[PDB]
DNA sequence: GGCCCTTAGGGCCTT
DNA sequence: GGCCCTTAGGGCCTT
C-alpha cells in the first residue's frame, strides 16, 4: 500500500449497467493534490470550497453500442448526439490524453471513484485494456462505498444520499457534477479517507475488467 | 478559410502583463462543436445553459520566473502554492495532454480567447514554441474582442466583465479563474452565437500566422 | 503593443 | 456481481 500524493476523483457516464455490456460515454477526471486535502479551503462564510490548484479533464466519446432506456435519460446523452459533435469512441486519442493528465500528476496517484470497485474501475479497465493501454504502476484505487460504510461503525450510503446528510442541501445536475459532489464528500471526511487509502487501497494492476471485448 | 467545426474556448493565468515577459500558470480550454453553438440551450429560468457535450481540460503549472504581485492577488496562485501541489512547468506532459485533447476534437479546431491575438495566442505560442510544439493545421484563432466592436458597428466597455454584466444583467461567480472565465466567454460566444459564427467563419485569423510574445 | 475615440491626448484590454 | 442483511432469501450500489 503506497502512499498517494495526488487523488484523481473520477466518475463514468455510460450506456447501461455491467449486463449491458456498458461502454463510456463520457468520463471526467479531478486531480487533487494530497496537501489540499490534508488542510481543506473554506470560505468566509465558512463552506468547503474545491481546491485552487485543480487538474481537470473531461472527455466525451460515442459507444459502439447504443444506450439504454433508464441510461440516456439521466446521462442527457445520446448514441447520435455524440456523433453529432464528432466525439469518436474510447480510442487512441483518450488514452494518449488520459496519460498525458495522469503524467501532469505527481505519483503515486489514488483514482477515488464512488463504487468503484464494482463499476468505475473494472468498466475503465476493459475499455483501457482493448486498447493494450497500461496505467502507472503505483497507481491505487480508493472506493469510497465500503470505506464510509466501514469508518461509520438502517442507513443509506448513495452518492445522492450521502451529499444530502453531510451537506444540508441538494447537489447540482452531468459526470463532471458528480466528480464535483464525490470530491467535497471526500474533503468532509479528508483526514479519515486518507488513512483509508493509505491503509486499503487497491492496486490498479489488480483489477480485473468488467468484461472481455 | 477553413470553416470550423468544433470551437475551443481558452483563458490563461499568467505572471502578469506582457512587458514583464509572462509565464503560463494555469490554462483551460472548453471545446464545443459547432452544432452546440447553432443551437444555444437555455433553462426554464431562463439562463444560457452548457452544452451537454463538452469536452473540458484544466492544468496547473508553475512558471520559471515569479509573479507579479497582482498577478498573484487576481489569479489565486502562486509559485510556492503550485509547487506544494507538485506541478511542474510548461513541459511533454501539457503538450502531450493538450494534442491529445485537441486530436480529440473534429476538426478544424477554431480557439477562443477574450483579447486573444494582444495576450493569450501570442503567450501560448511562446510557451509551444519552446518545446518546439505546435498545434495542428488548418486551425483558427478568434478573438471575441474586436468581434463583438466589430459587430456594433452594424448599428461602452468591452472587458469580459463589462459584456457579462451588460448581455446577462447579472454577476460571473468565479474571477480570474481559468476555468470559470472561459464558462464566462462561453456565455457570452453563445449570447451572439450567430453573429460570431459567421464572424469566425469569414475572418479569423490562422494560428500558423500568429506571431509568439516573446523568444527565450 | 495595438486598436479605440472625441489635441503628438487619453485610455482600453489582457494578468 | 460483490456484499451485508435475517418454495436456491433480497436489497443495496453504480448507469
Ligand atoms: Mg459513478
Ligand atoms: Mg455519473
Ligand atoms: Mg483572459
Ligand atoms: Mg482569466
Not at 1 to 16: H, I, M
Not at 98 to 112: T, Y
Not at 186 to 198: C, M, Q, S, V
Request: charged share 20%.
Amino acid at each position: 500500500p503506497p502512499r498517494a500524493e495526488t487523488f484523481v476523483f473520477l466518475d463514468l457516464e455510460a450506456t447501461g449497467l455491467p449486463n449491458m455490456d456498458p461502454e463510456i460515454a463520457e468520463i471526467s477526471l479531478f486531480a487533487v493534490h494530497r496537501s489540499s486535502l490534508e488542510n481543506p479551503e473554506r470560505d468566509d462564510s465558512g463552506s468547503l470550497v474545491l481546491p485552487r490548484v485543480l487538474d481537470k479533464l473531461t472527455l466525451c466519446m460515442c459507444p459502439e453500442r447504443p444506450f439504454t432506456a433508464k441510461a440516456s435519460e439521466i446521462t442527457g446523452l445520446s448514441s447520435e448526439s455524440l456523433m453529432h459533435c464528432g466525439k469518436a469512441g474510447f480510442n487512441g486519442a483518450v488514452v494518449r490524453t488520459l496519460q498525458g493528465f495522469l503524467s501532469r500528476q505527481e505519483g503515486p496517484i489514488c483514482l477515488v471513484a464512488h463504487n468503484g470497485f464494482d463499476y468505475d474501475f473494472p468498466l475503465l479497465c476493459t475499455e483501457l485494456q482493448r486498447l493494450g493501454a497500461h496505467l502507472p504502476q503505483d497507481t491505487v484505487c480508493l472506493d469510497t462505498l465500503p470505506a464510509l460504510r466501514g469508518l461509520d461503525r438502517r442507513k443509506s450510503y448513495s452518492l445522492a444520499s450521502l451529499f444530502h446528510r453531510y451537506f444540508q442541501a441538494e447537489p447540482s445536475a452531468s459526470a463532471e457534477g458528480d466528480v464535483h459532489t464525490l470530491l467535497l464528500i471526500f474533503l468532509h471526511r479528508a483526514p479519515e479517507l486518507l488513512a483509508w487509502a493509505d491503509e486499503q487501497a487497491r492496486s490498479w494492476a489488480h483489477i480485473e475488467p468488467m468484461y472481455v471485448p
